[PDB]
Design a protein around this ligand. Structure first.
Ligand SMILES: Nc1ncnc2c1ncn2[C@@H]1O[C@H](COP(=O)(O)OP(=O)(O)NP(=O)(O)O)[C@@H](O)[C@H]1O
Ligand SMILES: Nc1ncnc2c1ncn2[C@@H]1O[C@H](COP(=O)(O)OP(=O)(O)NP(=O)(O)O)[C@@H](O)[C@H]1O
Ligand SMILES: [Mg+2]
Ligand SMILES: [Mg+2]
Lengths: 340, 44, 90, 13, 341
DNA sequence: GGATCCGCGGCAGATCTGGCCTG
DNA sequence: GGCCAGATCTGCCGCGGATCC
């Protein structure tokens, strides 16, 4: 899988015509407010990623935006186009209009941004949401199960809050959905962890791991039964998959209370790389990797280790203030991209 | 008001009085010279 | 012929003990807060309305909490609707 | 010493 | 204002005896996981500040008590501060006797710069409003009292509205008694605060900066309340008041949470902190101590040069990072020990 | 082109940590 | 010792954007 060519028109402050990355590792160098982030975001969007408001991606004082990418995978090349404006996105695959759910099947790309630290140093809700979306990216049953469980819990809470009534079927539905959600989460986390541990061991010297806390580990029905008095007193369901907690551990201690900036950044990068490797082993071919602002808050040894690890990937693009040594480099000045 | 600086510095070092407390004490001692002369002559 | 209104007997005794003035004394059921459900009906406003005869001045000795201020405002509005000059402590 | 400094400063005021 | 000596015992991973910063610009250099942040946090907590970290997580692994000690001298005279961190709670000993924490609020103190400001600038509406409230609350206590009273009155009126009917105009007047005062105080503070921020930011970059505060109730709380009775009846909640204002930061006349990069946002956060430092120094007469963490990480050469130029004219400041600025005294941190060549 | 649905920013209400006054 | 101030956490409602017939 290689991104052969990429064109755009009226997208943020970009003012280029074409960009042709070479195979293997590459680099981008620019000063503040030049357009590295805009270029990476456009490349991510062109392949069918996720992002900024849809109306904020158009150049100032304009109404139409155009993105075009040409990728030649192993089986055969194909083209993509995007139209943005007031009406909305118009994704067409090789000339035929099609929905995004079709693009969901394609490999795509992985983007690493400074926004991934909040999944490590954030509150419980952010970590739970991150885990939910990470699991959802691999399977389709998970989203339907989550939606059904949410609706059932909403109905049960609404019925319980307003006086009293017969609560027999709602408990059955809630248990029937939770027993599957918890099992799927356990099955995924049993396999995810070793890859992350190995990747972090490659990147750094300490040890990393994951811990999941389950309120109802034996059954939703029994957990609901064993708390009826306080459930009726408070008026809310106090057990279920929607109250689990996920904690990242550095040397057996929570990361959101003891880790520093460099350790947190390394942990986030390791998580993203583990996800990339799992996606590559699952779909069939590794996706393109995009890393933004790779080496600011790291020392010399960590930067060298990161570069050595990234040297072995089929394709990657790095952006930052300082050029890595020994790799091809391209510069960005006021939105235009020029290469030697 | 430059004269009161030495008095404030002297009163600041003793324990139990904060930097703002010393200024308040000096100000209270400025217009109460009756006891102020006695205060200096209390121990000497 | 002076009347005062007080939340409870505790402030009644506290005010009388100092003894600045002597006059007719009145006590309410309590404050006026809707969080735990005490409206005008749950208070003794009805009893207060029986003996406005011969009254030329009323002072609202009420606490400094927000519920006290709301009660004082309600009482002032009601008495002004009936019509009596009112005062409050500083 | 320290007390004497206070004593001499008090004469100024 | 000037700091003279700092000593500690069993604080985070620190292990040292004493540290004597020189008067003027200073620096610190260290690799990852060495203790620069720990040292700055310890200094900030010793001088009477507030540390976001929990109290129970500021001691070593195994020990159960921590000790801090600082020696600072001001224009008035020297004095010593001491903190005893432990399981029971914080206690302060000014010159040797127990002192309430509110007393240190009158002292100069210090200001700390951290990426939390950068997070707050690019945050949601509620975070910006909370930042404005906390910033204003450091110049008066009347503001805090008014905020507490307004919150209690709003809760009372909302509880009344949620179910049933009763006398309602009384609570309306009660809430309007405080809303106008809060609005007037905010307007006056913003009017006094904006030009300093503009002139401070004009020396760090080239673009324009400003502030904007839109109000739901400008003419008065009562008039706006009487003009939205139907919406309140339908929804069941109050929809007008100071508790729904919006604060926006502008770069070249555009919102900064949608059209800004990392460098510009970091520069804005630093400018806000420097303006607060200048205003506080003017207020108390003696400017406080400035502590900067990760001074020049995500900045280019020109911005770093501009930052170094500004901090050279301050009485005393301490910078930390992974690189040594050219031409300034440098100290090194290795596994918790600070040695000055 | 109309209409049901899905996901996320924004806000009010309940819990909980650490400092304070009265005695 | 006992009451309050102020930050963190959880669930409900209205709004924007993708999909269908
Ligand atoms: N919609 C837009 N229309 C026009 N110009 C825009 C728009 N959005 C952003 N810009 C400009 O692009 C800049 C941001 O460019 P960006 O791609 O974030 O730079 P960057 O190289 O990643 N900088 P940095 O990350 O700080 O080192 C803004 O400061 C504006 O000058
Ligand atoms: N309570 C504690 N007891 C012992 N060690 C601790 C404690 N809290 C943190 N640490 C360790 O102290 C180190 C973090 O120190 P810190 O002061 O954050 O470093 P730093 O120099 O700012 N590094 P960085 O900002 O990442 O470049 C890590 O090795 C932590 O494991
Ligand atoms: Mg950027
Ligand atoms: Mg640090």
């Amino acid at each position: 899988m290689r991104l052969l060519l990429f064109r755009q028109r009226n997208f943020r402050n970009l003012a280029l015509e074409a960009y042709r990355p070479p195979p293997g590792l590459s680099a981008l160098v620019g000063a503040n407010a030049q357009g590295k982030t805009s270029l990476l975001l456009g490349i991510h969007l062109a392949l069918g990623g996720e992002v900024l408001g849809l109306a904020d991606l158009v150049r100032f004082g304009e109404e139409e935006a155009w993105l075009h990418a040409e990728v030649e995978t192993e089986l055969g090349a194909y083209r993509l186009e995007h139209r943005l404006g007031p009406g909305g996105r118009e994704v067409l695959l090789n000339g035929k209009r099609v929905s995004l759910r079709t693009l969901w099947e394609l490999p795509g790309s992985v983007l690493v941004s400074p926004l991934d630290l909040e999944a490590v140093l954030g509150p419980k809700e952010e970590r739970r949401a991150y885990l939910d979306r990470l699991i959802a990216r691999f399977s389709r049953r998970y989203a339907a199960l989550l939606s059904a469980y949410e609706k059932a819990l909403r109905q049960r809470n609404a019925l319980l809050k307003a006086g009293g009534e017969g609560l027999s079927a709602w408990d059955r539905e809630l248990a029937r959905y939770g027993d599957e959600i918890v099992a799927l989460r356990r099955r995924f986390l049993r396999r995810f962890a070793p890859i992350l541990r190995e990747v972090h061991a490659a990147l750094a010297a300490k040890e990393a791991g994951l811990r999941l806390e389950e309120t109802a580990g034996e059954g939703v029905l029994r957990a609901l039964e064993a708390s009826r008095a306080e459930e009726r007193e408070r008026g809310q369901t106090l057990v279920g998959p929607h109250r689990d907690d996920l904690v990242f551990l550095l040397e057996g201690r929570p990361a959101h209370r003891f880790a520093s900036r460099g350790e947190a950044k390394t942990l986030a990068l390791a998580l993203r790389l583990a996800e990339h490797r799992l996606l590559g082993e699952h779909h069939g071919e590794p996706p393109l990797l995009l890393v933004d602002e790779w080496g600011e808050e790291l020392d010399e040894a960590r930067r060298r280790a990161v570069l050595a690890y990234a040297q072995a990937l089929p394709q990657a693009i790095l952006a930052g203030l300082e050029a890595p040594p020994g790799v091809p480099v391209c510069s960005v000045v006021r939105g235009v991209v020029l290469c030697p | 008001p430059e004269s009161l600086l030495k008095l404030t510095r002297a009163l600041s070092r003793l324990p139990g009085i904060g930097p703002k407390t010393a200024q308040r004490l000096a100000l209270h001692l400025a217009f109460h010279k009756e006891e102020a002369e006695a205060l200096a002559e209390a121990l000497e | 012929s002076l009347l005062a209104v007080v939340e409870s007997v505790a402030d009644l005794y506290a005010l009388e003990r100092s003894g600045e003035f002597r006059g007719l004394y009145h006590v309410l059921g309590g404050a006026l807060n809707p969080l735990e459900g005490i409206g005008p009906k749950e208070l003794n406003l009805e009893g207060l309305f029986r003996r406005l005869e011969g009254v030329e001045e009323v002072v609202l000795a009420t606490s400094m909490t927000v519920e006290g201020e709301a009660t004082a405002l309600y009482l002032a509005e009601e008495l002004k609707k009936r019509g009596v000059r009112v005062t409050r402590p500083a | 010493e320290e007390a004497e400094a206070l004593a001499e400063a008090l004469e100024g005021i």
